Write an enzyme that holds these catalytic residues in place. Structure first.
Site, PDB file in Angstrom:
ATOM      1  N   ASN A 222      61.662  46.161  56.397  1.00 26.61           N
ATOM      2  CA  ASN A 222      60.579  45.291  56.590  1.00 26.61           C
ATOM      3  C   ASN A 222      59.346  46.326  57.362  1.00 26.61           C
ATOM      4  O   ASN A 222      59.675  46.590  58.574  1.00 26.61           O
ATOM      5  CB  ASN A 222      60.934  44.217  57.742  1.00 26.61           C
ATOM      6  CG  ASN A 222      59.645  43.617  58.015  1.00 26.61           C
ATOM      7  OD1 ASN A 222      59.559  42.406  57.465  1.00 26.61           O
ATOM      8  ND2 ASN A 222      58.889  44.204  58.407  1.00 26.61           N
TER       9      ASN A 222
ATOM     10  N   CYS B  37      56.002  40.216  52.246  1.00 27.18           N
ATOM     11  CA  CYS B  37      56.176  38.977  51.787  1.00 27.18           C
ATOM     12  C   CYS B  37      57.398  39.274  50.613  1.00 27.18           C
ATOM     13  O   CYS B  37      58.546  39.716  50.867  1.00 27.18           O
ATOM     14  CB  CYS B  37      55.210  38.280  51.087  1.00 27.18           C
ATOM     15  SG  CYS B  37      53.739  38.068  52.037  1.00 27.18           S
TER      16      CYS B  37
ATOM     17  N   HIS C 101      60.483  33.148  55.400  1.00 24.11           N
ATOM     18  CA  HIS C 101      61.285  34.118  55.255  1.00 24.11           C
ATOM     19  C   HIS C 101      61.353  34.395  53.758  1.00 24.11           C
ATOM     20  O   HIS C 101      61.529  33.362  53.188  1.00 24.11           O
ATOM     21  CB  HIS C 101      62.828  33.761  55.768  1.00 24.11           C
ATOM     22  CG  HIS C 101      63.626  34.931  55.913  1.00 24.11           C
ATOM     23  ND1 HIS C 101      63.220  36.065  56.646  1.00 24.11           N
ATOM     24  CD2 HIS C 101      64.791  34.925  55.687  1.00 24.11           C
ATOM     25  CE1 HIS C 101      64.355  36.853  56.682  1.00 24.11           C
ATOM     26  NE2 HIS C 101      65.118  36.613  56.094  1.00 24.11           N
TER      27      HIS C 101
ATOM     28  N   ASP D  68      68.463  40.569  52.119  1.00 24.80           N
ATOM     29  CA  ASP D  68      67.694  40.015  53.172  1.00 24.80           C
ATOM     30  C   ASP D  68      67.049  41.236  53.954  1.00 24.80           C
ATOM     31  O   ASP D  68      67.260  41.620  55.136  1.00 24.80           O
ATOM     32  CB  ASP D  68      68.461  39.233  54.500  1.00 24.80           C
ATOM     33  CG  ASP D  68      67.662  38.390  55.031  1.00 24.80           C
ATOM     34  OD1 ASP D  68      66.475  38.112  55.248  1.00 24.80           O
ATOM     35  OD2 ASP D  68      68.448  37.355  55.738  1.00 24.80           O
TER      36      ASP D  68
END
Ligand SMILES: C[C@H](Cc1ccccc1)C(=O)N1CCC(O)(Cn2cnc3ccccc3c2=O)CC1
Length: 332
Positions: free
Chosen positions: A10, A15, A250, A267
């Protein structure tokens, strides 16, 4: 690691970028072709093609969550709100358009079309006066309506449904003057890999819907074609489920990389195995973590599309040029 697959770092409000990247990455035929791309003498900072070779190479080899920074700079989405003011299919269209162009006059020319381009007919029929008007129209993705639609099938039905042109916005049938008419769409072809966007964001700014929309592991589409073909029927296998939470949001992507129905959640840097129920049914919505995009592969095409990819598939000039940059990076 636990899975054999590795995560992505990240590094911003990118997004859907990470979900989209792992979806493209696991479209093995696309991967193979990206690696063949003549990026020999490309400016190492402003070439979207190379930048994407980097990420793919990286997701294939490293043990360590990969990073996206050179790619985000590559294609020039660098502002706070650049990803908040666009959708997935716009990004997707930026990445694939770049790579399709680079692949011109090469061995791998025409890969992106072959993978994702289908063909639609758009027709206008007047009721009274006799006039009709067809024309082809290529698409690389489909936006499907949700609101008031319980499941995929109902969304398709609504897409190919006929619409009327009365009174206010009548149809200019040209020689025949204004005319009442019906316009609709129908599929001629559905591509190997089928990118379906679910229409959860609508406009007093845009708000997220969250109602129950269902989709299946297996999707028969023959019904929606203008003319079928009993040799290759239009049956799709579900491959990825891209998902979001809240309005606070998320963004995760579920995948069954080999089409064998063994599912992983991605994730960012954490990639665990999971059940089919978390991947599929838990993403329907109801009464707000749920699916905004779906990728289906034609069963006829599963093997070619998900063909196996070794490290022999990456070529030499690339491998060594990718090697160097890590080393210059190592100089710190
Ligand atoms: C910022 C926003 C978060 C979000 C909004 C709505 C639903 C889920 C998550 C986000 O990251 N988005 C990514 C996903 C979309 O691209 C999906 N999408 C695509 N095309 C459309 C065309 C017409 C109308 C509606 C949509 C739509 O919702 C929306 C934006």
């Amino acid at each position: 690691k636990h899975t054999g697959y590795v995560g992505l770092k990240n590094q911003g409000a990118t997004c859907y970028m990470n979900s989209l990247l792992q979806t493209l990455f696991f479209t093995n035929q696309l991967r193979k072709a990206v690696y063949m791309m003549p990026t020999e003498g490309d400016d190492s900072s402003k070439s979207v093609p190379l930048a994407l070779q980097r990420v793919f190479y990286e997701l294939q080899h490293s043990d360590k969550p990969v990073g996206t920074k050179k790619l985000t700079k590559s294609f020039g989405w660098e502002t706070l709100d650049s990803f908040m003011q666009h959708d997935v299919q716009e990004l997707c269209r930026v990445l694939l358009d770049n790579v399709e162009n680079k692949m011109k006059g090469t061995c791998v020319e025409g890969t992106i079309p072959k993978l994702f381009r289908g063909k639609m007919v758009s027709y206008i029929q007047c009721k009274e006066v006799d006039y009709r008007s067809d024309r082809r129209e290529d698409y690389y993705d489909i936006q499907l309506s949700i609101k008031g639609k319980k499941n995929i099938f109902e969304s398709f039905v609504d897409y190919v449904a006929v619409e009327q042109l009365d009174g206010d916005n009548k149809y200019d049938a040209g020689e025949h003057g204004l005319q009442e008419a019906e316009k609709g769409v129908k599929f001629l072809t559905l591509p190997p890999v089928l990118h379906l966007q679910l229409m959860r964001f609508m406009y007093d700014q845009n708000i997220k819907i969250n109602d129950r929309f269902e989709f299946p592991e297996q999707l028969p589409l023959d019904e929606f074609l203008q003319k079928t073909d009993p040799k290759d029927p239009a049956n799709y296998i579900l491959h990825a489920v891209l998902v979001h939470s809240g309005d606070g949001g998320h963004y995760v992507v579920y995948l069954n990389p080999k089409g064998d129905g063994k599912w992983c959640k991605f994730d960012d840097d954490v990639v665990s195995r999971c059940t089919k129920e978390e991947a599929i049914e838990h993403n329907y919505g109801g009464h707000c973590t749920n699916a905004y995009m779906l990728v289906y592969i034609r069963e006829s095409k599963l093997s070619e599309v998900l063909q196996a990819v070794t490290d022999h598939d990456i070529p030499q000039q690339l491998v060594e040029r990718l090697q160097e940059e890590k080393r210059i990076e190592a100089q710190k």
